DNA sequence: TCAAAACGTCGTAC
DNA sequence: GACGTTTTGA
DNA sequence: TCAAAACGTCGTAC
DNA sequence: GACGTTTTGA
């Protein structure tokens, strides 16, 4: 687990509160025991003409990748272990998205428990709802209620 | 002059690179000698439900103000002297808007001597052209070229 | 005549 | 910015 | 059955 | 985000 520079984490936290995103999703998927995937994503979005900035995130964080689609690019970090290491060191300096980062950390630690029992899986989905409530959520479709209707 | 904490500047520089703006305008106004106002503005925009974040900025920067218009709020720093002091300390930590920051610092330093000759005024106006170029400019009307047309 | 505020608009880059 | 659906590669 | 990637959509908050 | 137009008041 790499330890990040403090001056870098301070800058990055500011940028993240601005144009970053801490996302938790419940993704419908038949090939899972509970018919859903718990997905977490750290994301920093930026215009493609400035993807050089996002490339430097890949170099400094040491993990993750950049995806271009249209006129816009995104730094993506999804791997649960590095994501937990990174958000642990970024969380103290976040102001607008601190709670989300903490809920994500909380979710990742309780991930193996989430597969064991349907009750635990539902409660973790409840935390995903809390992250969604704190973000500027507009197009959310799958909630813990959706999961509760499936776990029967 | 007010000295700013380094860690405060590092975070803020990040958030500025994300949701902030360094704006330089040539405002057409007949009351001025050269029929144009040189206007500099440091801006930080945010959804009005997160207004407190910007209200916090005023207390920390110690100058400037917050204005609401609908679902969007802005922190504005227009006062030339506190702006120069602020930007001087913030500039080292900027990555996306560092060039435009430093250009603003040069305009401010040349403002008084730019009121003396119409040629130096035009030279300064070109510095604001460089700023609008570095920005994601989409609705710009008054450039140095239009200033040149009026000075004849 | 000027610094600064006030008020307003629009198209993406989030 | 913050989601959505679908596929890959174990 | 999973983690992760790939691919795709949409409404503002910049 | 990044501009625009108009007004205030020494
Ligand atoms: Mn933002
Ligand atoms: Mn931005
Ligand atoms: Mn933004």
Numbering used by the authors:
A (entry chain A), B (entry chain B): 2 to 153
Copy text verbatim from the article accompanying this structure deposition.
I-CreI is a homodimeric member of LHEs family, which recognizes and cleaves a 22 bp pseudo-palindromic target (5′- CAAAACGTCGTGAGACAGTTTG -3′). This region contains two catalytic aspartic acids (D20, one per each monomer).
Thus, a 24 bp palindromic DNA target is recognized and cleaved by a I-CreI variant (I-CreI D75N) with similar affinity and activity than in the wild-type case. The absence of the central metal ion in the non-cleaved structures, would explain the different catalytic behaviour. To assess unambiguously the number of catalytic ions present in the active site, we solved the crystal structure of the two proteins in complex with both target DNAs in the presence of Mn2+, which allows catalysis and unambiguous detection and location through its anomalous diffraction signal.
